[PDB]
Structures are given as structure tokens and as C-alpha cells.
Amino acid sequence: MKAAVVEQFKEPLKIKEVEKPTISYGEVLVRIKACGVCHTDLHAAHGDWPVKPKLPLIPGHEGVGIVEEVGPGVTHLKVGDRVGIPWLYSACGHCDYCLSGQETLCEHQKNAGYSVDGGYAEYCRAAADYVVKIPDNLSFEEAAPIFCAGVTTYKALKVTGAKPGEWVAIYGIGGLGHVAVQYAKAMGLNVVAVDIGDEKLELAKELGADLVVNPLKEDAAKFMKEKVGGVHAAVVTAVSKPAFQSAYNSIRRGGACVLVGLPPEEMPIPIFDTVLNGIKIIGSIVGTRKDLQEALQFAAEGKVKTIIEVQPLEKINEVFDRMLKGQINGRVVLTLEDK
């Protein structure tokens, strides 16, 4: 089978032939039709994180396709089912985290496109219990970006604890942000879109943002304090010292600041201010199988749509470069099918 593979860190991926994966107990073979490209795939290829991935490595944790064959012991899935393989490739299913609906925290978890081969190929071996079905009226292309970006923003909003009618600030209207705006509105929330590019803010208004503000042209925190009395919660998709400080300052007392990004720096927080204002700082990444199913259901109902650009597997290295230079508006989905 054809596949994009990382043979050495920081070296371009090679599109070559590799063995077609074989399956056994509790697994399924998935023929990949599409796979979203995530910033995490880039860091995997560059091995710039503390816990480095395996090598060689087939990246991709936003791979969607059809079940070609089921292994022994698998009863809930059948040949022909349309599914996706998310970041949480597998969990133990028996630890405290797994038994309490927090499988994403399982210490024994395997991650697709990082510790095990992913969706950047024609075929991918997957753990049957952990793949998630794709709604019937959702195309593979539309579905792919929901497997990480969509579920990630949807879960982050649930983590804020904001109920219908309350206000939330979405910092960064990019790959994750433009989707976060849509989930928030679908969840009965009022949104304040924050971003330095007016192009993005206009896009946010088209997607349902009730208010927009550019940090470069005006004080974002002050704007929200004066306009709505401070938001009930903030979701930071583009984590950086300044963005986090602004968000921390725009939330009303007792509010929550939810971080979704993955930067290598440290964020200073005022102890006096945090305690006195009862502020909460929460980190949130991806989501459980239930969260993802819910995230997909909103898409299937037409409440959420991702701005996508389709590209062939061979152009993966081009995509990574455009990503490093921030020359990507929206999300990129690779197709491994002959369109």
C-alpha cells in the first residue's frame, strides 16, 4: 500500500510503498478515503516533543474510511461501516480514568499517527472498540476535520461549563477557532470572537459570532467588560503569553479560562488575582468517544461546517511548509482516493 512516512525527524516525508497491515483479535482494517492534517502531525514529524514518536512513522489521527475486514471478537462493527480513527487509538478500558468516562487520560493509551501508524496511508490497522462511526449524511471530507479539531473545540466548550445564554470568548479564529464559534452557537451560547486579523473576524461574523474585537486595534478585555460585563468563559485556541493574559483578563469572576493549544513555554498567573476572583484555568484536549459522536452529530445536522482544502497525499510536505508559514486558511484534508 501507498503511504506517507517519516523515516527521520525534520526530514521530508517519503511517499512510498509499504506492507499492508494485517489484523487480529479486536482490530479492524480500514481503507482510508481521507485524513485531516493536524499541527500535531507536524510536531510528530519533527519529533520536537519530550515524548518522541516511533520511527518509521505513518502520521495522521484524522483518518476516515471504510472497514475492509473485522478481526476475531469484533461484533459491533461490520465490513462496510464508515468510521474514523482519532488520536485516542486505544485505551486500557479498566483504569480509573477509563471507567469514569475520561478515557482520554488513560496512561496506557496508544495514539494514532504517533505511537502507532495512522491515516496518512491507504490502509490502517485500528482497535475496533476505539474507532468511531460516521453519520450517514456526512462525507468523508467533511467528517475528517471533526475527528480532532471539531471534537477538541466541542469538548473545550463543555469544559467551560457555560450554559445556554452565557457568553464565551473564542481566542483565535483559525483552524480550530472557526469551528469553535459554530459549536458554541449550537450550544446556545453568545460568542465574542477575538483575532488580530480583521479577515478572520468578518469570517467569524458570517459563522455566527455576536461580537468581534481586534486586540491590535483595541483592548480586548476592556471591550468585553464594557460590552457584556466580562465573558463567562474563554477558549484559547492559539495559546501564547499575550493571548492567555488577555483571555485571563476578559473573564468575569468565577469564570473559566480553557486552554486548547500546545505551546512549549510557561504561562505566569497572578496568584492574588486568581484566588480573589475565583478564576479557573483548565487544559483540555481532544475528547472521548462519546464526545466525538456528539461532535459528529452536530455536523450531520448542519450546525457546524469546516472550511477545508483537499489535497492529494503526495502534497503532504507542501502542506506542512504552508502550515509552518501560516499560509493556510482553514483545514487541509488529504485524500488517498482517486477522485
CB of 62 to Zn ion, least distance (A): 7
CB of 205 to its own copies, least distance (A): 16
Q: Which does 278 bind (CB under 5 to 8 A by kind): Zn ion, its own copies, none?
A: its own copies
DSSP, res 24: -
* Shortest Å distance, C-beta 40 to Zn ion: 4
Task: Return the number of the residue (95 or 196) whose C-beta is nearest its own copies.
Answer: 95
User: What is the maximum span of the chain, computed from C-alpha positions, in angstroms?
Assistant: 61
Q: Binding site annotation covers 124?
A: no
Select 162 or 201, whichever has its Cβ closest to its own copies. 162
Name the site residues for its own copies (rule: CB under 8 A): 25-26, 49-50, 72-73, 76, 92-94, 96-97, 99-102, 104-105, 107, 129, 158, 163-165, 186-188, 190, 229, 239, 252-254, 259-285, 288-290, 293-294, 297-298, 301
Which of Zn ion, its own copies, none is residue 25 near (CB under 5 to 8 Å by kind)? its own copies
Site string for Zn ion, 30-49 (x = CB under 5 A): --------x-x---------
Contact partner at residue 254 from its own copies, Zn ion, none, CB < 5 to 8 Å by partner kind: its own copies
Task: Tell whether 257 is in a known binding site.
Answer: no
- For residue 70, the minimal CB distance to Zn ion (Å) is 18
176 marked ligand binding residue: yes
Please report whether residue 104 would count as binding Zn ion according to CB under 5 A: no
What Å distances lie between residue 222 and 24, 87, 249, 279, CA to CA?
A: 58, 37, 8, 17
H or E stretch at 284: none
Looking at beta carbons only, is 136 or 272 nearer to its own copies? Answer: 272
140 binds, options its own copies, Zn ion, none, Cβ within 5 to 8 A by partner type? none
Closest CA to 184 of 206, 214, 164, 211: 164
Q: Is the dihedral of CA 249, 255, 260, 265 positive or negative?
A: positive
CA distance 156 to 164: 15
Neighbours of 266 (CB within 10 A): 7
Smallest gap from residue 319 Cβ to its own copies (A): 24
**Which 8-state DSSP code applies to residue 294?**
H
- Residue 106 in the binding site for Zn ion (CB under 5 A): yes
User: Please, are residues 200 and 121 in contact by the beta-carbon 8 Å criterion?
Assistant: no
Q: How far is the CB of 204 from its own copies (least distance, A)?
A: 18
232 belongs to an annotated ligand binding site: no
Calpha distance 245→237 (Å, rounded)? 13
Asked if 284 and 158 touch (Cβ cutoff 8 Å), the reply is no
177-186 and 149-160 helices, crossing angle to 10°: 50
Beta-sheet pairing, 82-85 with 132-133: antiparallel
Q: What sign has the CA pseudo-torsion 66, 69, 74, 75?
A: positive
> Using CA atoms, how far apart are residues 57 and 185, in angstroms rounded to an integer?
38
User: Annotated binding site for Zn(2+): which residue ranges?
Assistant: 38, 61, 92, 95, 98, 106, 148
User: Annotated binding site for NAD(+): which residue ranges?
Assistant: 172-177, 195, 200, 260-262, 331
- Contacts with Zn ion by CB under 5 A lie at 38, 40, 91-92, 95, 98, 106, 148
